[PDB]
Ligand binder design. Structure first.
Ligand SMILES: [Zn+2]
Lengths: 91, 69, 147, 114, 120
RNA sequence: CAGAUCUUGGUGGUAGUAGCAAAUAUUCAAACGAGAACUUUGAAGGCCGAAGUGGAGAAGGGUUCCAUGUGAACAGCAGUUGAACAUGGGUCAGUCGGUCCUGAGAGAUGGGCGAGCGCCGUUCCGAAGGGACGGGCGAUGGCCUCCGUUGCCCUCGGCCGAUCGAAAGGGAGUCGGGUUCAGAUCCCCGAAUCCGGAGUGGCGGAGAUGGGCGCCGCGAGGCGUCCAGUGCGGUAACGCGACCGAUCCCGGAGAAGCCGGCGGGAGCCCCGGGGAGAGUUCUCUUUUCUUUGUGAAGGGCAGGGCGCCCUGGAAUGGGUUCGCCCCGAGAGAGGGGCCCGUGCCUUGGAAAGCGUCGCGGUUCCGGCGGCGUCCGGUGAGCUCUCGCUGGCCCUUGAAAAUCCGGGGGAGAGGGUGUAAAUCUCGCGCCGGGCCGUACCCAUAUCCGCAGCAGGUCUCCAAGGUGAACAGCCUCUGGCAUGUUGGAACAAUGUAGGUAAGGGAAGUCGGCAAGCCGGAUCCGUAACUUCGGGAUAAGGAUUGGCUCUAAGGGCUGCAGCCGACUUAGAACUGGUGCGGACCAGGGGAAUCCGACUGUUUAAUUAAAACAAAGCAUCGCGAAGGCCCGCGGCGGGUGUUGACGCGAUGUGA
């Protein structure tokens, strides 16, 4: 953007705390504050009410999600493997 | 308090068995009677002094004090 | 749940001996939501966050909120981001070997429950607290140990 | 300009010590402590964000004198909802219920017909 | 005395920069200035729409310009809209010349073929 | 007894000495009086200047309260005065609080340990419900009509833990005027309330009063039959005045952080007209100053707000906020419903209150007569309060006592004039015990051995100036310079000022002092983690008065009228213009610590500790670590390797 060069969102941390700390935190401060798309009603209303808990806007649903996002790579691969074991068990 | 828009019902309260008194009050704009019943002050607001003086005599029972200024 | 990043799931169960409901609080397995129907017991087949006794599941059902002895109401591996992997059973003597978060391999007796799926609140330790005050606010909801 | 004084024993600020200003007949500005407002009943389904559009909202201890009719909608299975419940929860309690009972009948016929 | 001095200052004396301690943003804030401007311009455009002087497309393509304050003051807006309305009038008139000059020949052709089939 | 820094008691010299110096300040006349630098009245000049030297409270003090009288002792002088002394008097509550409940906790019997007073522990090792709708039997009281009471027999229940713990949390219900030598939301006057009572229903209203029938009848109703009657209306939101009901169940309210933004109501402030008293008049000034009101609870009305409804179906995408935001899950568009409702009308209600002119009682009077309490504006103002919408978290934001909504229908009730019912439908009868209730709330009623520049928790906050609760001055409200006056104006001091020339030469060191300082317009370096550095440095302007342009709404103009701010220009003063006030000295380097934070109360604010970041080490609860005199003791543990516990370093 015109107002900055490479601070992104963590400009609000002034000139303190270092450099790679702010680089390692900007990558997460955008994800946790973005609004995801509720895959239950389709609208753009998914938001973090605290650590690990995601809310929607209209369908009023609440889903336990990651601390900074809504699907950890671990969670999604575990769901896939759960599918692949139910398939094996139930033929 | 309460307001009574109806002369006959006002009279019915007047000849109930529990009104302590009735105060007649005059002013160049209006005349208002106030029956102090057991629990409420029932005010009647007559804006036509001729019908007001006819109602004054209409008020039947033995409690007619007091007339004010 | 204040002072823990693994948010709890409050569940309403019909009580099959009277006319009432019991409302429990499990450790929400990742990916469950409001308005899901959670299946608990011996014959409830594999689904996310649908607890069924270890030993009647295949090898690799990534569980969390495991038990320790049959009937503890769930003890092991329920903090934010953890899970325990069943390796293989011993059909007689009802021993199932689980691999625990710290690389341990414990021989847990079978027929003890475990919620299927990983713990919510995962990925929590990847963001530097970045400021003494924030660390203070973290520990002041748990215990007087921080400075 | 009149600086005023608390009329009761407290001299602190709290929630139970809350004030409104008014004028007597005798042209004097006085305090008047007010009854903190409350909320009308809400979603007995626990998902509808709204709060009920049918019922007087007053302190819950006031209800011992309020009229029956004023404290609930005229509908059945209502007066313990919120506007979104009063409408959509009461519709949902049917669009689920009747469909499910009928589908139970259908699948019972299916169990009989292998 | 204070009423006299306030009257004089209202007229404008005493208010040179020599008597202004504190920020210009403190004499009258940017936020309030912008509110005053924009709540006037939009109460203008809605009134236009009611009057039918401008329809939905003009109004809703003006409602982002007024927000990005390409336009500054009510008079600026008045001139600009009177001017675009003049330009739409120009486009309509110059389309009307087009359709007329079309149809003239497009049916002189029919009467021309009548003449041709009379001469042949 | 001469002694022991001897013990107790007593008295000198120092000595009429130190001293009665912190926060500007007093003066004239008079009265009482043997008596006035201080008491009181009257005047004048000053201060606290709404973050008060004001008007109230919580603790805490405990008669300091109030009247009178005394001035023997105290008030570091005096004193006719007091907070002193002595004698009298004062605290009125269903509605104000406590009591009521629970929080962090605390603490009992079961159990355990302990020589033992006892300790551990709070659902853990306990036969933990003394309750009840109802059926049956007995025993009764009226009038054992048929209702009331008791015992017995069933039938039903979670003991899911005694008890205490909040004059700031939760906790239903009182307001206005009047009164005292002191007490008022208490006493008086008036007008309302909440709960509990009436199980002899006190009254009216609802239940609910008919539909079909054959016959005397124009009709009306009628005779006898039967049958229905635990509400009505709107398509909807929900309305109407009430509209049967238990164990049981589901829910709701009680009951939720901080911060930004905006609107609506309110009080206050400001302005234009009135009126009514008063100030000024040496000239002016339709002038300047004070005043110019309606509670509780209702009944209605605007006024805000909705994620509430019905119709219809939107891309040429639209709606619209200060920002956002919402839309085939129904946009705009119309037609509605509800929630709040302090604002306005009226009931209270002008009789009361107030301000004025007047007459009596002339004394005590809640004395009596008059005329008034009127009409507009304004707003980014301030303070409350109400609401919408956002931002923040590895923090998510108290609990119960209490009251309420629905689901379900165990039961009840009647025979065509009527019952059981009535979550409060309107009236009417009756009750609400106990304790606190004065005063100060602080440079005088408290703690500091005091009438001590120390300390101690809150509400409310006018005008001007100016960004402003800054500093400066002034109104309502107080005050007599903070344990004394008088006359002098020497040295030293203490606190403030000023200076020719030179500018740190002084000194361990620019210690102290001094210079800059607000705005607006220009303008910017090294270096850098790219946001900073940064008000860098550096320069210019700044008064008064006279104008011009631009920036609005209400019924294309036309007409209506009002609030401030900006930009430019002319003229003017002994070159003066943030004119009191308010207000940053600056730069090039080195060392240490990353920064913010914290510490040696009473000599050490730092380079010390902390701190995020980094790295370790143990531990899969028959556990790691740890307390313990003791036990199935106890913490971390409402915990489980992204977790605990033990360390080192330190962006
Ligand atoms: Zn959604």
């Amino acid at each position: 953007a015109k107002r900055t060069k490479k601070v992104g969102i963590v400009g609000k941390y002034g000139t303190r705390y270092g450099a790679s700390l702010r680089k390692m935190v900007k990558k997460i401060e955008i994800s946790q504050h973005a609004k995801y798309t509720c895959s239950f009603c389709g609208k753009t209303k998914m938001k973090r009410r605290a650590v690990g808990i995601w809310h929607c806007g209209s369908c009023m649903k609440t889903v336990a999600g990651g601390a900074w996002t809504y699907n950890t790579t671990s969670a999604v691969t575990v769901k896939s493997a759960i599918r692949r074991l139910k398939e094996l068990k139930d033929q | 308090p309460r307001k009574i828009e109806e002369i006959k019902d006002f009279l019915l309260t007047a000849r109930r068995k529990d009104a302590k008194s009735v105060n007649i009050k005059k002013n160049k704009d209006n005349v208002k009677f106030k029956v102090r019943c057991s629990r409420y002050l029932y005010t009647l607001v007559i804006t036509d002094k001729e019908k007001a003086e006819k109602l004054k005599q209409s008020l039947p029972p033995g409690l007619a004090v007091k007339e004010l200024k | 749940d204040p002072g823990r990043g693994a948010p709890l799931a409050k569940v309403v169960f019909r009580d099959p001996y009277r006319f009432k409901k019991r409302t429990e609080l499990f450790i929400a397995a990742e990916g469950i939501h409001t308005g899901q129907f959670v299946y608990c017991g011996k014959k409830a087949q594999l689904n996310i966050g649908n607890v069924l006794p270890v030993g009647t599941m295949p090898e690799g059902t990534i569980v969390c909120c495991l038990e320790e002895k049959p009937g503890d109401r769930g003890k092991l591996a329920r903090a934010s981001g953890n899970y325990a992997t069943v390796i293989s059973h011993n059909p007689e003597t009802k021993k199932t070997r689980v691999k625990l978060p710290s690389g341990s391999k414990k021989v847990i007796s079978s027929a003890n429950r475990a919620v299927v799926g990983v713990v919510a609140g995962g990925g929590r330790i990847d963001k530097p607290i970045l400021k003494a005050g924030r660390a203070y606010h973290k520990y002041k909801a748990k215990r007087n140990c921080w400075p | 300009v009149q600086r005023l004084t608390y009329r009761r024993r407290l001299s602190y600020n709290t929630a139970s010590n809350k004030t409104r200003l008014s004028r007597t007949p005798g042209n004097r500005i006085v305090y008047l402590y007010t009854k903190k407002v409350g909320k009308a009943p809400k979603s007995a389904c626990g998902v509808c964000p709204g709060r009920l559009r049918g019922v007087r909202a007053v302190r819950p201890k006031v209800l011992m004198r309020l009229s029956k009719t004023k404290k609930h909608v005229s509908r059945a299975y209502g007066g313990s909802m919120c506007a979104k419940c009063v409408r959509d929860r009461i519709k949902r309690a049917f669009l689920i219920e009747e469909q499910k009972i009928v589908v139970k009948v259908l699948k019972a016929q299916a169990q009989s017909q292998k | 005395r204070c009423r006299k001095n306030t009257l004089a200052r209202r007229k404008g004396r005493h208010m040179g920069i020599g008597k202004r301690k504190g920020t210009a943003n403190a004499r009258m804030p940017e936020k309030v200035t912008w509110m005053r401007r924009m709540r006037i311009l939009r109460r203008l455009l809605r009134r236009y729409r009611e009057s039918k002087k401008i329809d939905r497309h003009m109004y809703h393509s003006l409602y982002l310009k007024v927000k990005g304050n390409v336009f500054k003051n009510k008079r600026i807006l008045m001139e600009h809209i009177h001017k675009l309305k003049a330009d739409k009038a120009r486009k309509k008139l110059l389309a009307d010349q087009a359709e007329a000059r079309r149809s003239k020949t497009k049916e002189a052709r029919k009467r021309r073929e009548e003449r041709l089939q009379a001469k042949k």
